């Protein structure tokens, strides 16, 4: 846990650790 | 967003919280 950048591979691991069993859907591309 | 907030900067668990449910 550390305030930093989570490029997709880190995000998928920071979004699962933060909301894994809850599942999610992140695929933006602006 | 989540793609430009953490790789392109620092996003938190509450900022990433906008993608859970």
UniProtKB/Swiss-Prot annotation, chain A:
Q: Which domain of life is it from?
A: Eukaryota
Q: What is the effect of changing residue 22 to Q?
A: In MODY10; reduces binding affinity to INSR; reduces biological activity; reduces folding properties
Q: What is this protein called?
A: Insulin B chain
Q: Which gene encodes it?
A: INS
Q: Which residues of the full protein are shown?
A: 25 to 54 of 110
């Amino acid at each position: 846990f550390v305030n930093q950048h989570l490029c997709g591979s880190h995000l998928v691991e920071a979004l699962y650790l933060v909301c894994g069993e809850r599942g999610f859907f992140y695929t933006p591309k602006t | 967003g989540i793609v430009e907030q953490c790789c392109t900067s620092i996003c938190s668990l509450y900022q990433l919280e906008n993608y859970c449910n």
